Structure formats: C-alpha cells, structure tokens
Design a protein around this ligand. Structure first.
Ligand SMILES: [Zn+2]
Ligand SMILES: [Zn+2]
Ligand SMILES: [Zn+2]
Length: 285
C-alpha cells in the first residue's frame, strides 16, 4: 500500500493539519510542529496533544503515515560549536515534540559547513547530533532528507547520507527521505524511466532501500544539476510527469509517507488523486 499526501498547514493548531489532510483525501501528511524561527517553542500542552491525536485517529492517520519536518534554521553540522549546541537543543526539542504527539519519524536536512569546516568533519558533526538526540528520546527515527546542495548545504550526494548513517550508533532509528526536486537539482536525473532506475540503483548501492522512510514528490522549477531548490507542481517543471508515474508503480515506495511539497495547494487534492491513479494506469517502463 502507498500513503500519499502533502505538507499541509498547522495554522490554528496541530490538529488542523490532520483535518486539512482529510479534506484533500490524503492518506499521509507532513507538518511543522512549531513556528520555524523560534529557538525554543512553548511546550506542547496536554490539550494540543489530545486534539492532535483525536484528529489523527478520526481520519485514520497512524504514525507510519505522518512525516513531520524540522525547522530550516537547525544546522546539525554547524562549524561554530556554540551554534551547533543550540541547533542540537532545538533538534532534541523537535524530537521530543514528536514523541509527545505519538509520531515516530522526523524529517530534516542534514546541515551546512559555512565554508569553515571540511565536508568530512561536517558530516561527522551531523551523525553525532543524531546520536545525542537518539540518546535523549525514544521511539522516533531521525529521517535525513537529501538536498539540492545550495550554498554550503550537504546531503546533495547519496554518499553524504551513507556517511552520516555510518556514524550513527543506533541505526534502527536513522533513515532517509528522498525529495525528487532536490535529487534532480543535485544532478540525479529523473526525466525518463531509465534515468529513474539509474538514480535509484545509485541510491541502492550507496545507502540502500532498507533506510528509505519517506519521499517528497516535487517537480522542479530549477534545472538539472543547478543546485538550486525551487519546487514545481507535478508535470509543470523540468522533471515532468513520468518520474511520478514510475515511483507510483514501484513497490519499493510502499508503506512510507509520500509527501507533496508542490507550490499550488489549490490543486493538492487533484495531485493526490492523479498519483493514486498512476499505480494501476498504463504501465511505464
Ligand atoms: Zn525538506
Ligand atoms: Zn523535501
Ligand atoms: Zn526543497
């Protein structure tokens, strides 16, 4: 079974994310559990937690179907150790919020070296950040998202993801999420079925599908290899519709949240319905 949805708004409270997902007939969703800017969020109340859990149960969203995203301001590889510690504090807080909400996954971009430390050293700092958070929480898997590679952001090569995982002690609570826009921007082609298979065999050799815990299904406004992160609605960007048919027809993408971060929320219900239909419509190679 595939689980298909969108990164919906949590405006008016976390439970409204589940309600919004249900209104677009999603079978998965993503959300932020707090505003991104605030270093430290007011603690979750018992009232917020119960309303969230009640809405998830009303609309049949289990923990396996929900892929929260951390704040973009967290840098788990920060070269300034005092800033690293503040990012680690925020990440532990985000992981604790997930635990309190009954969530089992947390998706995050790995980090950035700010031209002050080597790639190797930044990746090692990120693995240690994960280890710290996993020692301070229970039941939540740290899901590393690949990136477009803008600026000094790491995670644009699959080998980066594998290097982080190698440094994680409890590998049962680490995984990865592949964002199709990010992959394409980083130079992994997706424009034909053959190219999709080439990209995912590379993923299999370097990381392995045993670590795959989510996908972000985005077309790309930016161009191939541009190392620019600009999403587009399915079919409207430079990837095109065939990659998404290919993903929907491949059983390796079952059982995990498949999340739109496409740029027109008015068509999310149509994008979700189209994705569901491609599972059984005309086969691509
Ligand atoms: Zn992301
Ligand atoms: Zn993404
Ligand atoms: Zn992006």
């Amino acid at each position: 079974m595939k689980y298909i949805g969108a990164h919906v708004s949590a405006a008016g409270g976390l439970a409204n994310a589940a309600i919004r997902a249900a209104e677009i007939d999603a079978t998965a969703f993503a959300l932020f559990t707090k505003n991104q800017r605030q270093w430290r969020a007011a603690p979750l109340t018992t009232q917020t937690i119960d309303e969230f859990k009640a809405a998830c149960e009303k609309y049949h969203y289990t923990s396996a179907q929900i892929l929260p995203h951390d704040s973009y301001l967290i840098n788990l590889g920060h070269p300034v150790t005092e800033a690293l510690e503040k990012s680690r504090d925020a990440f532990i807080d985000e992981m604790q919020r997930c635990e309190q909400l009954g969530l089992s996954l947390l998706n995050f971009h790995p980090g950035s070296h700010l031209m002050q430390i080597s790639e190797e050293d930044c990746l090692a700092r990120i693995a240690e950040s994960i280890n710290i958070a996993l020692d301070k929480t229970q039941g939540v898997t740290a899901v590393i998202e690949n990136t477009a590679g803008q600026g000094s952001n790491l995670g644009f090569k699959f080998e980066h993801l594998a290097a982080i995982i190698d440094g994680v002690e409890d590998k049962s609570r680490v995984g990865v999420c592949i964002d199709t826009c990010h992959a394409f921007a980083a130079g992994y082609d997706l424009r034909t079925p053959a190219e999709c298979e080439k990209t995912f065999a590379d993923f299999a050799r370097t990381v392995g599908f045993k670590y795959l815990r989510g996908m972000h299904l985005n077309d790309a406004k930016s161009t191939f290899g541009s190392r620019v992160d600009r999403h587009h609605s399915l079919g409207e960007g430079n990837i095109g519709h065939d990659a998404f048919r290919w993903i929907m027809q491949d059983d390796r993408f079952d059982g995990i949240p498949l999340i739109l971060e496409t740029i027109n929320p008015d068509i999310w219900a149509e994008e979700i319905a189209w994705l569901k239909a491609q599972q059984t419509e005309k086969a691509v190679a």
